Every structure is written in C-alpha cells, then in structure tokens.
C-alpha cells in the first residue's frame, strides 16, 4: 500500500526488461541482482521492507 512509486512506472520497466532486451535467449531467467535489476528507477532508501517477511 505504501509503495512510494507510481506502479505503472515499475511494471513497464520490468516488462521491457523481460522483452528481447533479455529474452532473445528464451531459457534465461530474470531474477537476482545480476539480471533482475531493472535499471535504476531511483527511489528513496529506507530501513523498512514494505513487505514483511511472512508477507513475502
């Protein structure tokens, strides 16, 4: 609920990242900090997860 970013901005970036920009090799998984890091949609940094672990 408190996600401090306009949702459609992140959805679009992630979808584009999953596009042929990365999935010309269809077996590649988009995860982790090596590949799942959609380029910086700068946001404030905080000591709060937003999603508590049980929620995760």
């Amino acid at each position: 609920t408190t996600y401090p970013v306009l949702p459609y901005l992140t959805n679009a970036a992630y979808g584009a990242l999953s596009a042929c920009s990365t999935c010309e090799n269809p077996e590649l998984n988009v995860q982790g900090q090596t590949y799942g890091l959609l380029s910086c949609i700068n946001m404030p940094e905080s000591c709060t997860p937003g999603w508590e672990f049980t929620e995760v």
Partner: protein
C-alpha cells in the same frame, strides 16, 4: 532482507554448533535399577539423547 548476499533467498543459512550429520547407527540397550525420583516410566523402553537428562 538484512545483508545483501543473503537477501535474495537463494541460500538459506543456519549457524548451529550442536547439530550432527551421522545417520543413526547401531542401537544399544541398557538396563538396571532406578531411584524413586526417576520420572521415567517403570519397565518402559525409552530413548536417550544427552547425559544431563539423568536424575530427572
């Protein structure tokens, strides 16, 4: 989240100085008298797992 290297959840880490790897091996049986405070059930086969459970 905590430290980054463990953030993604690929690796779930436990630190414990009291575990053990051995698959349970040969089984041995011991028999004898007991004193009155012995909470164990009389004439009942029981498992044991430490040297301090004695007396109790």
């Amino acid at each position: 989240m905590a430290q980054d290297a463990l953030s993604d959840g690929f690796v779930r880490l436990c630190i414990d100085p009291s575990l053990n790897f051995f698959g349970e091996g040969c089984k041995i049986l011991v028999e004898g008298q007991i004193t009155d405070d012995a909470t164990a059930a009389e004439n009942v086969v029981t498992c044991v797992n430490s040297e301090l459970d004695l007396v109790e």
